[PDB]
Structure formats: C-alpha cells, structure tokens
C-alpha cells in the first residue's frame, strides 16, 4: 500500500508556488526539500544524501537538518526554509540552484530581544515560516523560545516580533505583554495585517496583529488561565467550546477562512475566524490511514498544509509519512485522497559537531570519543586533538592540544576572557581500527563552575 512504498519520513510542513504549479516538501527526517508538481512528479530535490548537515551550496552540496516549515516568494523564486535543528533560516535559490543561510549560525541561542543581521543573530528552534511580500519580512515561528521574529529580507535585520519568552497564552496589546506556546505554525491573512498562529503547546490559534505585535485568542485553550497547557480535547464549536490538542499547521485561504491541522487528534479541522467556529473537515480522530469520504477518513499526526488557487489542500500527513490532498469545492462529497509520489527517490548518499553553549565563566569539558562495537583505538597512532578559540584569547582553555586517553576521553579546563561571546573549536584525529572537529560556543551567564560532556561516535 501507500505506506509501504513512501520516500518521505516524517515531512512536516508544504509551501506551493501557485503560478508555476510547484509543490515544496519538507522531508524533514530525511534532511531535504522535494520540489515536485501537483500532481506529484518530481522536479528537484535539495540535500539527496539524506544527511543531517549544516552546509550552504549547490543543490549538490547543500545540507539541512530536521527542517520544517517553508515559505515561497514568488517575486524572487526564492524558498525559505525553518532549519529547524540548525536553528537557522536558509534560502534555497531557484535561479542559481544555491542554498544560503539567511539568520542562525547552527548553535542554540538564548537572545530573546535579537536585532542583529543575519548569521551574526541567533535563532532558537524556528519552525515556520511565512512571507509578507508588500514590507518583504518573513516571520518566524520560534517554537523554541515561545516567540515570533521577523527577519527583514531588505537587510537582514532578525528579531522579536511578539513574545515575552514565557510560555503561556497571553494575548496582550504589545509585544511584551503577549506571550506564546511553542508555536508551530504560522500563516498570513489576507490583506496581510495579521498572521494566524499554531499555538501548539496551549492548543489554539491565534491571531498576531503585524502592526502591533499583539495578539488575540481565536479559538481552543483557556481563555482565563494562560498558564494552563491541559485545556485540550476534541470539541468542534464556537470560541471557548472548541477544544483541540497541539495544532502544528494552520493555513489561511484567500477567502479568509482558517484550515488547520488538529495534529494530536488526527484531523483536519476548519476554523471562521470572524465567527470563532471550528468544524471537524477530515479525520474520524482515530490515528491511521484511511482514504475516501473526509468525515470517514484517518490521518496520523497531520502537521502541514498548503493550498492552490482552485480550492486543492494538500496535507502533510507527517506520521504516515504521505502528502494526501482534499478538493474544497466538492463540499460534503469532499474525498481526502493520497498525493501518489512519482520519480522522487528515497535518500541514496572532517566531521563538524556543534556544541550545546557553554554558559558558566570557568569549568571543564568532559571530551569523550566513542567508538562502534568491534573497533577499538589504534595502538600505535594515538588519537591527538588541537584547540583554537575563535576570536584569539577569548577563552583561555588550559590544554591547547594533546592525545586522547585509552577511553577516547580528556578533560580541558576553560576561562572565559570576558563577557562576549565565542567559539571554540577542537580539532580531532582519531584513528581506530577520522577527522572530527567540536565547535564549542562560549558565553557567560553565571559565575558557578560547569562541567559539560561533549560527545561523538
Ligand atoms: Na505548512
């Protein structure tokens, strides 16, 4: 059946590009875009490998890890890419057939104002995107600190747009007094003065006013108790009635009205934003694959969504790892039907091993190389590794070089110079019977001694 023949694995998240009948997915747990046509034939793929990687570049070169929400711009045939475990946004380049990284440089961040231009700002677990074409922003659903960013196209200038960085469900005037729930997904209405949210972890959607920075409640969740993440269900009706349980996707048609995928209740439901109603569109709510008839179908963890001009909603039906499709102007006789994929293969493929930041002013770094059963380290060749810091004498870090244990293991004791921030890097030569560098991001936050493992087999 379907299932046993999908090339995808776990795609989260679909843009389309209506004039050129384009159909973006994000394969996300193979690490690549698929650009097919809509009907399902494959045009181009980006990151073929399948590899997680972090890597600007030719289609060829070029690599992602974890992605998932995209967003074209149809002036420039651009697509813009939430690399999600990359922390970073990328662009892929149709007219040169270039990937580049836009914001985010790989590495974690804590920085929950922002400001600065492209790689040089930190990103925090984006996970969609969405494109305003008439001020060129992209706005950025930043699951990871329960925040909205937007990140000027024009000059690269990336920062909050709306959130406190607590996680509840605040819906304030201002971007301060607003905060979010890890929100997962984010799209523009119509006349472009507002975006519509996923707001996964309180389970509702809302509204993000772009000129404010406010928000507003629309429906699910509690509207009395932001601090509540328990107020999920399945309830189909109006405003305070509804209950959903961790909307990933949500998406806004031309003619106004909200789809969104119900993403723990394995439907797709329909929202009216003016009247609050929301009503079970596809999904009996049992997790599954089924076929035909909307109100008798099943899906599995739906999490993206895209639409044509002609009233075609294409689903990322991520735990089937399938695209199914619904016509919208066949009404109650409306079929979900599967998006049969053909010509896009499954992937055919000194290592670089980003850190989690170091936030303590002085510690140590537990450095521990493992190796697969079977091997062991050569005898003979001891594995010896090389320390740099990236701007020179921000971190003092004792030993500059040296051999590895029998373990693979050393132990490093760091300084920080000061209050900025770096990066270390730790080149590695193992040989076993490899070259793997440790980049190590410094920044102080507490003066309390700490000891992080860093790891690689
Ligand atoms: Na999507």
Known sequence: GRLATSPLKFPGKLAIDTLNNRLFISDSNHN???????????????????????QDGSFEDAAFNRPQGLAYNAKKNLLYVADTENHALREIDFVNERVQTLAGNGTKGSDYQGGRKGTKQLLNSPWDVCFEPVNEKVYIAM?????????????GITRVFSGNGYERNLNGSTPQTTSFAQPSGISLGPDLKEA?????????????????????????????????????????????????QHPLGVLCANDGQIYLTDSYNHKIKKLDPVTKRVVTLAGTGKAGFKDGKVKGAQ????????????????????????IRYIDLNKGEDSEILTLELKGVQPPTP??????????????????????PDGYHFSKEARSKFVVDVEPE?????????????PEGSTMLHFIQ???????????????????????????????????????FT
């Open 350 to 371: 000194t290592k670089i091993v980003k850190v989690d930041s170091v936030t303590s002013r002085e510690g140590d770094l537990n450095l521990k190389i493992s190796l």
């Open 143 to 155: 699951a990871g600190q329960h925040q909205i960013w937007e990140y000027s196209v024009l000059d």
């Open 393 to 405: 004498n921000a971190v003092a870090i004792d030993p500059t070089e040296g051999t590895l244990s």
């Open 32 to 54: 690549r875009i698929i650009v097919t046509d809509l009907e399902g034939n494959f045009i181009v793929q980006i990151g073929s490998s399948g590899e997680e990687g972090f």
């Open 417 to 455: 110079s000061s209050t900025s921030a770096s990066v270390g890097k730790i080149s590695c030569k193992v040989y076993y019977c490899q070259s793997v560098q440790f980049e190590v991001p410094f920044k102080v936050e507490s003066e309390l001694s700490a000891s992080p493992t860093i790891t």
């Open 299 to 322: 899906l599995s963890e739906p999490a993206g969504l895209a639409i044509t001009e002609n009233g075609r909603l294409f689903v990322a039906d991520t735990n089937n790892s399938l």
């Open 196 to 244: 519509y949210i996923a707001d996964s972890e309180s389970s509702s959607i809302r509204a993000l006013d772009l000129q404010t920075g406010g928000s507003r409640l629309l429906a699910g969740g509690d509207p009395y108790f932001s601090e509540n993440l328990f107020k999920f269900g399945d309830n189909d009706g109006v405003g305070a009635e509804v209950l959903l």
